[PDB]
Amino acid sequence: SMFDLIGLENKITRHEAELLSKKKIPRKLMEEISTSAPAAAKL
Amino acid sequence: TQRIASHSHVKGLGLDESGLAKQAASGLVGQENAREACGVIVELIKSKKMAGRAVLLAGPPGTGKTALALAIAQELGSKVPFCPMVGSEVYSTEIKKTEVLMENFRRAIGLRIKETKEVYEGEVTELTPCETENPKTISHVIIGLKTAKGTKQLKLDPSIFESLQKERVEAGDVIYIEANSGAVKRQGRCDTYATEFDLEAEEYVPLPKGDVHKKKEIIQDVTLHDLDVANARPQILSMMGQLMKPKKTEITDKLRGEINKVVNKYIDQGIAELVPGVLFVDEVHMLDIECFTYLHRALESSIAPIVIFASNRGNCVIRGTEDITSPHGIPLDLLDRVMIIRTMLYTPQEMKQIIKIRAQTEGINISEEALNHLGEIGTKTTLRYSVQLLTPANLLAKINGKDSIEKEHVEEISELFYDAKSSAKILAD
Amino acid sequence: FEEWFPQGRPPKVPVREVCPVTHRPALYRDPVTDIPYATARAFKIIREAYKKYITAHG
Amino acid sequence: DVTRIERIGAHSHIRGLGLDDALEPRQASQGMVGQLAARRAAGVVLEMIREGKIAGRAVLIAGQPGTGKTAIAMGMAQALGPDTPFTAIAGSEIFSLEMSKTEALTQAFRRSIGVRIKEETEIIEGEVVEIQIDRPASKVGKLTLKTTEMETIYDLGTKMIESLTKDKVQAGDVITIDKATGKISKLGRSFTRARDYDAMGSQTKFVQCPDGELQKRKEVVHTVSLHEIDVINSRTQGFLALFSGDTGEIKSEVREQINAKVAEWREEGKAEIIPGVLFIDEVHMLDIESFSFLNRALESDMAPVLIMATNRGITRIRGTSYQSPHGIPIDLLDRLLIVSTTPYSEKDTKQILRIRCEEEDVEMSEDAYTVLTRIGLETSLRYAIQLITAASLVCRKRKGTEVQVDDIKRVYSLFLDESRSTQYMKEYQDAFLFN
Amino acid sequence: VTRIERIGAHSHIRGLGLDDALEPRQASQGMVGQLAARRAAGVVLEMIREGKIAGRAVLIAGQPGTGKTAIAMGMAQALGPDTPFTAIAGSEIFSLEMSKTEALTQAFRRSIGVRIKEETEIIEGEVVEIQIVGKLTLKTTEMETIYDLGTKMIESLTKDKVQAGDVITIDKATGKISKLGRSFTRARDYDAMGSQTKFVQCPDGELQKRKEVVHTVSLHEIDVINSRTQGFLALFSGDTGEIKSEVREQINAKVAEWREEGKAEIIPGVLFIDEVHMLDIESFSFLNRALESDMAPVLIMATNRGITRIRGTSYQSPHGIPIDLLDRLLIVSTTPYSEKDTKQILRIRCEEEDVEMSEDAYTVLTRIGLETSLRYAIQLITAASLVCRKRKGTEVQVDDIKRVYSLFLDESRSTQYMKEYQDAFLFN
Ligand SMILES: Nc1ncnc2c1ncn2[C@@H]1O[C@H](COP(=O)(O)OP(=O)(O)O)[C@@H](O)[C@H]1O
Ligand SMILES: Nc1ncnc2c1ncn2[C@@H]1O[C@H](COP(=O)(O)OP(=O)(O)O)[C@@H](O)[C@H]1O
Ligand SMILES: Nc1ncnc2c1ncn2[C@@H]1O[C@H](COP(=O)(O)OP(=O)(O)O)[C@@H](O)[C@H]1O
Ligand SMILES: [Mg+2]
Ligand SMILES: [Mg+2]
Ligand SMILES: [Mg+2]
Numbered sequence A: 001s002m003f004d005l006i007g008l009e010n011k012i013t014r015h016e017a018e019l020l021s022k023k024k025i026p027r028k029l030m031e032e033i034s035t036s037a038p039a040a041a042k043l
Numbered sequence B: 001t002q003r004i005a006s007h008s009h010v011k012g013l014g015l016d017e018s019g020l021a022k023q024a025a026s027g028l029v030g031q032e033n034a035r036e037a038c039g040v041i042v043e044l045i046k047s048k049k050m051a052g053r054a055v056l057l058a059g060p061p062g063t064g065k066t067a068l069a070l071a072i073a074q075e076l077g078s079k080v081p082f083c084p085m086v087g088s089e090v091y092s093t094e095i096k097k098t099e100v101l102m103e104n105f106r107r108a109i110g111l112r113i114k115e116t117k118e119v120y121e122g123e124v125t126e127l128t129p130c131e132t133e134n135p136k137t138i139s140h141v142i143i144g145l146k147t148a149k150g151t152k153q154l155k156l157d158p159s160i161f162e163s164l165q166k167e168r169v170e171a172g173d174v175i176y177i178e179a180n181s182g183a184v185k186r187q188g189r190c191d192t193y194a195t196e197f198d199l200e201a202e203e204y205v206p207l208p209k210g211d212v213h214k215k216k217e218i219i220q221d222v223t224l225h226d227l228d229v230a231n232a233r234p235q236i237l238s239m240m241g242q243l244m245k246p247k248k249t250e251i252t253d254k255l256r257g258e259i260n261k262v263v264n265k266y267i268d269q270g271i272a273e274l275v276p277g278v279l280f281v282d283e284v285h286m287l288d289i290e291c292f293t294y295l296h297r298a299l300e301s302s303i304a305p306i307v308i309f310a311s312n313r314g315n316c317v318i319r320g321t322e323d324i325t326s327p328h329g330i331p332l333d334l335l336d337r338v339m340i341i342r343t344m345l346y347t348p349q350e351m352k353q354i355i356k357i358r359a360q361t362e363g364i365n366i367s368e369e370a371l372n373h374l375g376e377i378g379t380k381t382t383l384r385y386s387v388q389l390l391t392p393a394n395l396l397a398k399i400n401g402k403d404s405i406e407k408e409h410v411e412e413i414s415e416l417f418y419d420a421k422s423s424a425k426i427l428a429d
Numbered sequence C: 001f002e003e004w005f006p007q008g009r010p011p012k013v014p015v016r017e018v019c020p021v022t023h024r025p026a027l028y029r030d031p032v033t034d035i036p037y038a039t040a041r042a043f044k045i046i047r048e049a050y051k052k053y054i055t056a057h058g
Numbered sequence D: 001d002v003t004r005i006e007r008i009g010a011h012s013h014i015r016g017l018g019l020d021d022a023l024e025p026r027q028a029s030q031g032m033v034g035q036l037a038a039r040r041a042a043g044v045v046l047e048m049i050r051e052g053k054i055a056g057r058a059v060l061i062a063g064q065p066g067t068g069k070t071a072i073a074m075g076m077a078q079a080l081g082p083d084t085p086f087t088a089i090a091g092s093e094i095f096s097l098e099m100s101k102t103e104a105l106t107q108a109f110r111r112s113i114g115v116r117i118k119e120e121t122e123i124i125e126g127e128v129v130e131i132q133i134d135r136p137a138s139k140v141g142k143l144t145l146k147t148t149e150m151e152t153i154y155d156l157g158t159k160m161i162e163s164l165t166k167d168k169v170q171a172g173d174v175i176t177i178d179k180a181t182g183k184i185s186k187l188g189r190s191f192t193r194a195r196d197y198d199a200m201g202s203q204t205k206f207v208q209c210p211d212g213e214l215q216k217r218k219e220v221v222h223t224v225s226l227h228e229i230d231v232i233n234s235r236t237q238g239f240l241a242l243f244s245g246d247t248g249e250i251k252s253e254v255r256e257q258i259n260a261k262v263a264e265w266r267e268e269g270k271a272e273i274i275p276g277v278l279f280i281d282e283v284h285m286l287d288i289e290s291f292s293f294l295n296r297a298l299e300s301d302m303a304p305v306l307i308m309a310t311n312r313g314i315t316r317i318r319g320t321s322y323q324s325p326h327g328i329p330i331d332l333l334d335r336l337l338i339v340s341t342t343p344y345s346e347k348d349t350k351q352i353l354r355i356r357c358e359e360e361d362v363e364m365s366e367d368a369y370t371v372l373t374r375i376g377l378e379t380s381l382r383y384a385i386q387l388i389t390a391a392s393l394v395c396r397k398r399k400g401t402e403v404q405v406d407d408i409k410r411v412y413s414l415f416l417d418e419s420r421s422t423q424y425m426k427e428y429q430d431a432f433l434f435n
Numbered sequence E: 001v002t003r004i005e006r007i008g009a010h011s012h013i014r015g016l017g018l019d020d021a022l023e024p025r026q027a028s029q030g031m032v033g034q035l036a037a038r039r040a041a042g043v044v045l046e047m048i049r050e051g052k053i054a055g056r057a058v059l060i061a062g063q064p065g066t067g068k069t070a071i072a073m074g075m076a077q078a079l080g081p082d083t084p085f086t087a088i089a090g091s092e093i094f095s096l097e098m099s100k101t102e103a104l105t106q107a108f109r110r111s112i113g114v115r116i117k118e119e120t121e122i123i124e125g126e127v128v129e130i131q132i133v134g135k136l137t138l139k140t141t142e143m144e145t146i147y148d149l150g151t152k153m154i155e156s157l158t159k160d161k162v163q164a165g166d167v168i169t170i171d172k173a174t175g176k177i178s179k180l181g182r183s184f185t186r187a188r189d190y191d192a193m194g195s196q197t198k199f200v201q202c203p204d205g206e207l208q209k210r211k212e213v214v215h216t217v218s219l220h221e222i223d224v225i226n227s228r229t230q231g232f233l234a235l236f237s238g239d240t241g242e243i244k245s246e247v248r249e250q251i252n253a254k255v256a257e258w259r260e261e262g263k264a265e266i267i268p269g270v271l272f273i274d275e276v277h278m279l280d281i282e283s284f285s286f287l288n289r290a291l292e293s294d295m296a297p298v299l300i301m302a303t304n305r306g307i308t309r310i311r312g313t314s315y316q317s318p319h320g321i322p323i324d325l326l327d328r329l330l331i332v333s334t335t336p337y338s339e340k341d342t343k344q345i346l347r348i349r350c351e352e353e354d355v356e357m358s359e360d361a362y363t364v365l366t367r368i369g370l371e372t373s374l375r376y377a378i379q380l381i382t383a384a385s386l387v388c389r390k391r392k393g394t395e396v397q398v399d400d401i402k403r404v405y406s407l408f409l410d411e412s413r414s415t416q417y418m419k420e421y422q423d424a425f426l427f428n
Helices: A014-022 A027-036 B032-047 B065-076 B097-107 B160-166 B224-232 B237-243 B253-269 B289-299 B348-362 B368-379 B383-388 B390-399 B407-416 B420-428 C040-057 D036-051 D069-080 D101-111 D158-167 D226-234 D238-244 D252-267 D288-297 D330-334 D346-360 D366-378 D381-397 D405-414 D418-427 E035-050 E068-078 E100-110 E151-159 E219-227 E231-237 E245-261 E281-290 E339-353 E359-371 E374-390 E398-407 E411-420
Strands: B054-058 B082-086 B109-126 B129-132 B137-146 B151-156 B173-178 B184-190 B213-223 B272-276 B278-282 B306-311 B338-342 D058-063 D086-090 D113-134 D140-146 D151-155 D173-178 D184-189 D215-225 D271-275 D277-281 D305-310 D314-316 D323-325 D336-341 E057-061 E085-089 E112-118 E121-131 E134-139 E144-149 E166-171 E177-182 E208-210 E213-218 E264-268 E270-274 E298-303 E307-309 E316-318 E329-333
Touching: A014 E177, A014 E213, B032 B054, B032 B065, B032 B306, B032 B338, B032 D381, B032 D405, B054 B065, B065 B082, B065 B278, B065 B306, B082 B097, B082 E281, B097 B109, B097 B224, B097 B278, B097 B289, B109 B151, B109 B224, B109 B253, B137 B160, B160 B184, B213 B224, B224 B253, B224 D238, B253 B272, B253 D238, B289 D086, B338 D381, B338 D418, B348 B368, B348 B383, B348 B390, B368 B383, B368 B390, B368 B407, B383 B390, B383 E329, B390 B407, B390 E035, B407 E035, B420 E307, B420 E316, B420 E329, D036 D058, D036 D069, D036 D305, D036 D336, D058 D069, D069 D086, D069 D277, D069 D305, D069 D336, D086 D101, D101 D113, D101 D226, D101 D277, D101 D288, D113 D158, D113 D226, D113 D252, D140 D158, D158 D184, D215 D226, D226 D238, D226 D252, D252 D271, D288 D330, D323 D330, D330 D336, D346 D366, D346 D381, D366 D381, D366 D405, D381 D405, E035 E057, E035 E068, E035 E298, E035 E329, E057 E068, E068 E085, E068 E270, E068 E298, E085 E100, E100 E112, E100 E219, E100 E270, E100 E281, E112 E219, E112 E245, E134 E151, E144 E151, E213 E219, E219 E231, E219 E245, E245 E264, E339 E359, E339 E374, E359 E374, E359 E398, E374 E398
Parallel strands: B054 B306, B054 B338, B082 B278, B278 B306, D058 D305, D058 D336, D086 D277, D277 D305, E057 E298, E057 E329, E085 E270, E270 E298
Antiparallel strands: B109 B137, B109 B173, B109 B213, B109 B272, B129 B137, B137 B151, B173 B184, D113 D140, D113 D173, D113 D215, D113 D271, D140 D151, D173 D184, D314 D323, E112 E213, E112 E264, E121 E134, E121 E166, E121 E208, E134 E144, E166 E177, E307 E316
């Protein structure tokens, strides 16, 4: 499926793909998330 | 538009009011007799009286046949449909050659549709029914419509209440109501009620400008072939048709007759106006015998456009025949149905004029001695070759920091690039 | 009849909210204070003011 | 005045064959000039078509180019009228990528045979004077129609109520109701809608009130060709292929079923066969396979009258190496009658030029007529015809009223015929390609 | 590692090897000799870059092995990847799916790039809470906002099953929702993950960003997309059929309007048709008219034929092209290589193939190439390299060249040996 191209035409967009590439979670952030593991009022 | 083509300098037949061709005007040089006859052909097209009249441009290569056809097209304007074709295009893989020919015939007959719609559009301000005693009974439905110009109240027929609830029209909704049917159509909440905090896109629209009641004229230009294609395959059967490849179809004469009837009805009703135009078939000698025979019947039709053929083949064997030679690769039977306009070879002076006009259109500064040298090259070789040397010589000059072509640049470009004859000489050796 | 012909009062024009921090046309509202704002700096200022207020009040 | 779809074509002057009651052609009638023997033969063939008793009669119109073969065919078509089908095809039209040549010839033959269906229908026709529809929120309704002679109140069923609502029938509408299927058609309005209603921006003319009884037994005539029946029965969505032409090779079993049921419909009173004409112009473009099919195809009882035209002499039959008269095999030539057309004289050419000038609305002097007749005799008839139009345009350019000799000489010098163009091509032959 | 692209017949060529003044440098960028032809190719490349003049045709004509395709590859490399360069063989147009004229039109339109700019306003953020009227709460690393939801918007949120913790993009111009992924967190770790699940960081900056995006397409792609409802599928399968003239004309006019509005840019490229003498008279006649269009790319052609029969006709013409099309183009002529040029070509090929050869080996291989053909010597380079490696050597010697010369024959020697035993071969 890593080579499936036509399946991406109905699933993603080039700008969305660039956003996904930029904002992918790095290893250190997952390590930190595993290591660590708002009342509204109408003013 | 912006890019410069081989014919981008042709702006029309340089004819005077008396129908005579100026020596050099509208980008055309010489071809006086051929431009005058093209002028009579342009008058024939604009007269709209005749159908199926054929004219053959015949003459040596590089004698302006295609330039004269595009000049006729420029003279006719953008209203008249001018359909260029080349004879190689009839050999389609989806449909028969006669279908390609008939389709291109119908592409050159234009139709101009005139639609006049009366609409009452605005933001709804009230939807109060008018109760009454029957001779709860309502006799009218009052709708108040607001636009940037003002407000209007409409005493609509009571039956519109069904459409109002079907369209879910509410106060503050922008709608439009067509005069004829009286059916309401809703087009979104007025943008004056849109906040920046709510998320919707289609459901908001700006308040209509102009008067609440509007009379709109919509003019659409179509071809008879456009109607043919539209009525041949209207757009689960639609799902299968759109999944499968929508090949061209051999449209039947029944459909074309029905469409002719409908267009005649529109012309009688005044809704539409016909604009018969021109089909230009360049390299017509690529057609085969079956195509030429079909063209015999096609040119005799009262619906056919005016067709412009071009050939340079001389006495050549007709395609699809064996050893049957004809004066232009066209059977003599078709040649009896066409008027022939001869095109003649250019003089060195005319070649220089064309080279100068081309340089002007390409935006190239050419020196007088360079122009003379390129003209003399063009009296050898061909006109097309000498024209083609213009822009590479301009680039060579720009490399050498010269804003104008000097003779040395023409010499160098000629030394780099060769013409058909020099290459034939090299091949022979 | 009243189902088919509801006498709906015309919708009130919304309040064109303005950001109290920069006095620009409001584009957002903070979910926690329900106060509109127009920029990230406005959001930070509003949340700092809100934590100041909530510390002062209790 | 207004530019119609149909303009002045190459045969727009042909209105018929120009014959009397005894089929003796007139010198100049219905746009025909000369061709007395050919026109008399065309009249006899047209009578044979109109009698319809004989199937698969083939006539070939053979003659020199420009002698009036297509003109005679168009005259036959005009004198036949629209009731009798007349399918004209170019011989090159049968070479298709959608179907075989034999399938194309079958569809051409079956297109030239009309089937005139008749059925009786119950038709209600009257002015809506009152309509009441009551629905929950089953539907009930009451409709009253008037026709000057009577006024009847009807109690409406649910399906009729649905149809009336869909058609949006209102009082003052002159409507027609087909009792056989409930289809509702509106002929027109009888008076305006209430002036008090806004929008409704129309003041359409009001049709006159119907007369006689409300419900009448009406006989209606519907004509379809055999090809339409075939295409409709070929598949579930066949009717769409009548316009797009996406008809594959229709199964022969379906065609046999249709031939049988049509024979039953003509033994019964349901339909009448209208056999027509298939005109294959330039028939020499057909190959040996098409002629061989035409041989057997004319022996069918459902075959129409086949008219053919060709100017080829003894020439090679396409797809073969054999030479035969007219480019047609002797086996098919045996199955047809040949009608020969003769070259015209000075008087006939002048009369043809006069008729063409009349149809093109070109006023032209008698000296111009003489010089143009000389040109047409020297060069060709069609060339002179095209010089008529060119000289008209040149005369109107100079603001003249009558095309004179100077205009004809001008357009002659401007536009070349085949002979002068060929001479100039030979004079500059080295400039043209491949000598 | 063996990438998809390996050492081919033109891998050593990385441009035309010209200077700023277009003066051809000997042995530059992999090109050797062909000075006049390389200068002409540089002039044509400048024409292509300028773009002002549509439908200029150039025919690179010469003897076999004289670098015509080498010059074409150098032009393709020197020309940037931004500019289209459609390289096809003459035989690629003879298709059962579409007419030859359609194939040439598609090659023409593929060689014209159109670069379309677009600005959109989208809201991208991480979903904090959703309440079924409706309310949606979004946040970034710098902001938090709450929106009110319409009927269609709540329907879209429900159908896509947007759940708290997702990162979504909503376009204000169209009101459509796209789920970029779900943010990873202490509680959202699982033992297995779905195929669609993508982990993504919370978006930065402001929620309502203003975008500027530029799409690079070609006229052929636009034609195919507009050919039918699911036309873009044909951009993969190639089952485009024959695209109708209506679609092409409407696209040319729409692109003209876009360029007038400044939305799109047109990047005219090159259509290289190698071995062009496979085209028939119908193809050449179509090209004669096709080059007169203002959307025509610069056309480059290559052939080695002399005065030969035009395909589809009985006529003989120079380069197998009718003189109608020859008058419409400029001809660049290649020249046979000298001994020095042959040796330098062999040296560059050895350097690309990573082959170390002795000087005597260079002399003998150059003699073999001059006597038989350059391509044969190029092939013998790697042949002798393999034979030397099998010998556990580190430098290719003359003995290895003699060995491969005896193992692999050329056209002349093979023909002589075939004629010697012609009684055994078929249909002599
Ligand atoms: N009389 C003329 N005046 C100006 N330009 C001309 C003239 N004749 C030809 N040209 C130009 O020179 C080139 C000749 O090509 P074309 O007219 O297509 O010749 P052909 O008759 O071989 O088709 C075109 O670019 C055309 O615009
Ligand atoms: N007898 C005639 N009466 C009137 N017009 C004729 C007659 N014969 C020929 N014409 C006209 O002269 C032209 C000759 O073309 P056509 O009749 O098609 O000849 P053919 O079919 O024999 O080649 C047409 O415009 C035709 O209408
Ligand atoms: N100008 C050149 N510089 C370097 N190598 C060349 C040159 N021309 C040809 N070659 C070499 O010869 C082969 C390319 O020849 P090619 O261009 O295909 O000849 P043709 O003109 O017959 O197409 C390649 O293997 C390449 O190494
Ligand atoms: Mg031309
Ligand atoms: Mg005829
Ligand atoms: Mg090559």
